[PDB]
Design a protein around this ligand. Structure first.
Ligand code: 5IL
Length: 305
């Protein structure tokens, strides 16, 4: 037992991390089949990042300007094209370590593992969540772009995230693997504001179910509440409004646990109105919202790859 913020095994993704160099800009790229995906700002200097015209800047670039290396073995770029805010570099050889993969655009609240790399080689891995305002609180130094976020289900690596920039607030933004930014962000070095962030209510409830599973039961209350009443309380504390879909996705936890979902929301209302009172839940003094119900069921089922 015990509960931990657990990342996916990163090997299958380590096997596709290449270094992409263009002029003097160097960052990370993802080598799948005979295509290397990378952020389009690889074609920019920092003097270009204030207001870049990516079409005009890419037009004076040719295939021989891009240098792709996997560790030390090298890739011959034989084509290139810009899709939204990513560059697709067609190379001479196909990645022998290409796993079964998909490109999917995740929805807010859902989680993924980030493999943080620099110069095409991995440095760390950690689990994070796509905030309701389409940001993530990762850790990304300079050179870290092009690092990817992914989920792994049995055989399949579903890539969902490519890191692009750090907001002046200190949080991070990126695109899906088709180059479309999550949220209202542009790959431009200017002031960009994320919206009001809110807490992923269903995730907090899944984490409380995990807590009940692992022995911590002090927050377990005796009230229940209406869905509308809990939503009244949740909107005051800047929580996302709970829908019947959320209650349905919490069904397995509510059944293994024996605690009806609405009573768990009653306990959560009590925690929001009275605080945690100096105690902890699963080693945390705050209400954790970066576990989806599926993450809890994974850690309790020992789902493997
Ligand atoms: N010559 S470069 O094109 O600025 C550059 C050079 C090396 C590595 C990176 C960058 C990037 O931009 C970049 N993404 C980005 C996107 C929009 C606005 C600013 C940035 N960055 C943030 C990190 N500091 C440099 C500016 C990621 C990198 O890993």
């Amino acid at each position: 037992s015990g509960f931990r913020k657990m990342a996916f095994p990163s090997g299958k993704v380590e096997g596709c991390m290449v270094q992409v160099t263009c002029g003097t800009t160097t960052l990370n790229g993802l080598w799948l089949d005979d295509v290397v995906y990378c952020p389009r700002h690889v074609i920019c200097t920092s003097e270009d990042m204030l207001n870049p015209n990516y079409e005009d800047l890419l037009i004076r670039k040719s295939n021989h300007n891009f240098l792709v290396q996997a560790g030390n073995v090298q890739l011959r770029v034989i084509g290139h094209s810009m899709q939204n805010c990513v560059l697709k570099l067609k190379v001479d050889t196909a990645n022998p370590k290409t796993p079964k993969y998909k490109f999917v655009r995740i929805q807010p609240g859902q989680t993924f593992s980030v493999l943080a790399c620099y110069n095409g080689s991995p440095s760390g891995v950690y689990q994070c969540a796509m905030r309701p305002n389409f940001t993530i609180k990762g850790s990304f130094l300079n050179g870290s772009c092009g690092s990817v976020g992914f989920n792994i289900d049995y055989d399949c690596v579903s890539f969902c995230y490519m890191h692009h920039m750090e907001l002046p607030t200190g949080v991070h933004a990126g695109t899906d693997l088709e180059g479309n930014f999550y949220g209202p962000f542009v790959d431009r070095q200017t002031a960009q504001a994320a919206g009001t962030d809110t807490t992923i209510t269903v995730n907090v409830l899944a984490w409380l179910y995990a807590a009940v599973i692992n022995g911590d039961r002090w927050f377990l209350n005796r009230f229940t509440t209406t869905l509308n009443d809990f939503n009244l309380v949740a909107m005051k504390y800047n929580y996302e409004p709970l829908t019947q879909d959320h209650v349905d996705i919490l069904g397995p936890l509510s059944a293994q646990t024996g605690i009806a979902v609405l009573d768990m929301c009653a306990s959560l209302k009590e925690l929001l109105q009275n605080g945690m009172n100096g105690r902890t839940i699963l080693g945390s003094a705050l209400l954790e919202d970066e576990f989806t119900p599926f993450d809890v069921v994974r850690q309790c089922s020992g789902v493997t790859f």
